[PDB]
């Protein structure tokens, strides 16, 4: 049952949430090979665990940069939540630790690269292709939302493709455990729901809005609201007027009108029937939800794999030395990391 499984999931989660894993490795245990991506506070590098030969992706955050951007509480959220969750389409945190200068999150290496990369290169995805990815996100959001977690940064940049063609959600930097309402203005401009922009207070319905943005972007090749500057994007979103490509099927347009719905009493995922409004929509009529969950569906796209530490599905980034200070920075701030 969905009910049974989620209840079991919540018990598992709550024990880890109440007693988080801390200091489960050290930097010297890993050989650093190459940068896979970057972000405001640092970078994520392919690494190899010296005693096992296992590859992982190591996210390195500069404590002082976190502090400058007033992201301390968000970073604490990120690590506390990621070490507690477990779902087939969530990237797994394997180890975490800190030193004088940095925080480290050692996660599974997902070798197929970012959905972003593949989407931009290929132009757009077919409706079955988009649908296969969308289903994984729907199940993942049912899971997270059942734990009172809001994800708040859905976008193809954050979705990695595994060796079997399934999605792995990464970057829990804005994830938050909240019962009810929250107010932070965070996310990515193209993906923000109108109520975030209008400072209304918001809830998990913002992730369903963002699903609408993602499916559109996947199927069209461009997002439903774009411009050269974020201010113009926000104007377009609050306007809420959406135009669809002529090649979008009728069922797809109907789904998106219901996800990209400004009115929260009408937006799908946020009604009495909750996620079932989405799962039972006609666009998903061909989806076997249980088989998606069980990974028994053939992926529309399988990435190239030329070998275990290969990074050819990722862009190249400028490398820099990982200097660790001889003085502890921001110790009190990150004490529970």
């Amino acid at each position: 049952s969905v009910k049974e499984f989620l209840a079991k999931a919540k018990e598992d989660f709550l024990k880890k949430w109440e007693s988080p894993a801390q200091n489960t490795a050290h930097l010297d245990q890993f050989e650093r090979i190459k940068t896979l991506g970057t972000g405001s506070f640092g970078r994520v590098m392919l690494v190899k665990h010296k005693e096992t030969g296992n590859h992982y992706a190591m996210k390195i955050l500069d404590k002082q940069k976190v502090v400058k951007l007033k992201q301390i509480e968000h970073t604490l959220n990120e690590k506390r939540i990621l070490q507690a969750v477990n779902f087939p389409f969530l990237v797994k945190l394997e180890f975490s630790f800190k030193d004088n200068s940095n925080l480290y999150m050692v996660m599974e290496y997902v070798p197929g690269g970012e959905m972003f990369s593949h989407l931009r290169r290929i132009g757009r995805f077919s409706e079955p292709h988009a649908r296969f990815y969308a289903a994984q996100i729907v199940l993942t959001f049912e899971y997270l939302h059942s734990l009172d977690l809001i994800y708040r940064d859905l976008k193809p940049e954050n979705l990695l493709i595994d060796q079997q063609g399934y999605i792995q959600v990464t970057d829990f930097g804005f994830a938050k455990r909240v019962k009810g309402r929250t107010w932070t203005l965070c996310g990515t401009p193209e993906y923000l729901a109108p109520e975030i922009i209008l400072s209304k207070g918001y809830n998990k319905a913002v992730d369903w809005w963002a699903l609408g943005v993602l499916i559109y972007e996947m199927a069209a090749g461009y997002p439903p609201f774009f411009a050269d500057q974020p201010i113009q994007i926000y104007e377009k979103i609050v306007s809420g007027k959406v135009r669809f490509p002529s090649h979008f099927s009728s069922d797809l347009k109907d789904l998106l009108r219901n996800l990209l719905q400004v009115d929260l009493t009408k937006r799908f995922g946020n009604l009495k029937n909750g996620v079932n409004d989405i799962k039972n929509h006609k666009w998903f009529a061909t989806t076997d939800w249980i088989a998606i969950y069980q990974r028994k569906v053939e992926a529309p796209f399988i990435p190239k794999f030329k070998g275990p530490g290969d990074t050819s599905n990722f862009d190249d980034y400028e490398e820099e030395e990982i200097r660790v200070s001889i003085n502890e920075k921001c110790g009190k701030e990150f004490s529970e990391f």
Binding site: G39, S40, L69, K70, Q71, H74, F116, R120, G123, D153, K155, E157, G173, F174, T184, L185, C186, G187, T188, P189, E190, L192, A220, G221, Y222, P223, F226, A227, D228, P230, R243, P245
Partner: peptide, 20 residues
């Protein structure tokens, strides 16, 4: 075309998060 407008735009690369 909308596609052409997007490809000529400045936001076809990776998009940064907004913290505030």
């Amino acid at each position: 075309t909308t596609y052409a407008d997007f490809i000529a735009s400045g936001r076809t690369g990776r998009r940064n998060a907004i913290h505030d």
